[PDB]
Amino acid sequence: VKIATTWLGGCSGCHISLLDLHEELLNLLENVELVHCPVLMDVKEIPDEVEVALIEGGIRNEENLEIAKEMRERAKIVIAFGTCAAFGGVPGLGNLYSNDELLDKAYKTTITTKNDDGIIPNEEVPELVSRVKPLSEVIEVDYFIPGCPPNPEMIAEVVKALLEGKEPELPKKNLCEECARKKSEEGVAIETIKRNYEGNPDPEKCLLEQGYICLGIATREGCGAPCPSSGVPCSGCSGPTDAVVDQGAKMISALCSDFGIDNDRDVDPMILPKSIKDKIGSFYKFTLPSAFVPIRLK
C-alpha cells in the first residue's frame, strides 16, 4: 500500500512516535510502500495515487494550507495524525494573541534580539494564517489519531486496519478507567483547588479528588495514563471523547459541579474562579483551536 506522511504546524513528535515502533517500524515498512516522508527520504513532491496519508500538525501558515490541499487531492485516505492535526495543539495557544504580537515578540522585543530596523521576515517565507486551525477545518479528513503524540502501538493498529480493509476504531472512554489511581465509591468531591506545585500529592489517590486540575475526566483514554502514574495530573493531550466537542468547557463544567459538592448550598462560588489565575491555559492547552471560542477577541 502506497503511504505518505507530512508535517505542518506541529513539532515532529508524531513522526518520532512512529519511529518509536523501533524494530516493528521495519516490519511495517515491509508491508507498505513509503512514497513520501520529508524526515526519512528525499522525495520532494507528493506523488499521485497515494492511498493513505498521515498529516501531522495543524494549520499555522499559508504553506501548510497549500500542502494540506495538495495531499488531500493526491491521497485517497487522509489521517489527521496527532493532537495538533486533530485539535490544533499547543501552538493553538497563539490564538490568544494576534499574529503581529507573536511575530513582534520573536523578531523585535525578545531581550537578545538586535533588530533596530524592526523587520519581520517576509521574503521566501509563508505568511501566518489568521489563527491556528485543526486540519479538518481546511480539508476533508477521513480519520484521526489523537494524542500528543499518539502511542506507537495505536499508530500501527490504525494503519494495519486500513491495510486489511477494516475501519479503525479509537478507544471511546475517558482516562479514569485506564488510570491506576484510586477513586471513591461515594463519588468525586473537591474541597480546594491547588496549583501543581502546591502540597505533596498522595501517589495512590485520584489527583482530581486531591484538588489538582486533572484533565483525565475530559480526555480520551488510550495513552495508558502515564502522567498520573508518574506523579502528575493529566494535561488532556489526547483530546476529548467522541461525545464532547469542546474539552475545556466540559472540564470546567465537571470541576465547577463537584467543587464544594459536600457543602453544595454553602460553598462560595467565587473561590474557584479566583483560584485559577490562568483559565485558558488550565483547560485548553491542546485544543484551543477546536473550541467553540478558539481565539481571544482583540
Binders of ligand SF4 among residues 185 to 214 (CB under 6 A) are: 206-208, 214
Which of 235, 241, 247, 282 binds ligand SF4 (CB under 6 A)? It is 235
In angstroms, give the least distance from the CB of 287 to ligand SF4: 11
Which of 3, 4, 6, 10 binds ligand SF4 (CB under 6 A)? It is 10
The mark string for 262-291 relative to ligand SF4 (x by CB under 6 A, - otherwise) is ------------------------------
User: Is 81 or 283 the residue whose CB approaches Mg ion more closely?
Assistant: 283
Q: By Cβ distance, which residue is nearest to Mg ion?
A: 281
Binders of Mg ion among residues 279 to 298 (CB under 5 A) are: 281
User: Is 2 or 142 the residue whose CB approaches other proteins more closely?
Assistant: 2
Longest CA–CA span in the chain (Å) reads 65
Instruction: Considering only CA atoms, give the Rg of the chain.
Output: 21
285 binds other proteins (CB under 8 A): yes
CB 261 within 8 A of CB 217: no
Instruction: Tell the burial category of 277 from Cβ atoms under 10 Å away from its Cβ (0-12, 13-18, 19+).
Output: exposed
Per the structure block, which three cell numbers stand in for 28? 511495517
CB 70 within 8 A of CB 272: no
The mark string for 126-165 relative to other proteins (x by CB under 8 A, - otherwise) is x-x-x-----------------xx----------------
CB 213 within 8 A of CB 263: no
**Buried b / exposed e across 124-136, counting CB within 10 Å, b at 16+?**
eeeebbebbbbbb
CB 4 within 8 A of CB 75: yes
The DSSP line for 207-262 is TTTTTB--GGGGSBS-S--HHHHTTS----TT---TT-S-HHHHHHHHHHHHBTGG
176 binds, among Mg ion, other proteins, ligand SF4, none (CB under 5 to 8 A by kind): ligand SF4
Binders of other proteins among residues 187 to 216 (CB under 8 A) are: 195-197, 200, 203
User: Is 69 or 205 the residue whose CB approaches ligand SF4 more closely?
Assistant: 205
Binding site for ligand SF4 (CB under 6 A): 10-11, 13-14, 56-57, 82-84, 89-90, 148-149, 175-176, 179, 181, 183, 206-208, 214-217, 219, 223, 225-228, 233-238
Binding site for Mg ion (CB under 5 A): 278, 281
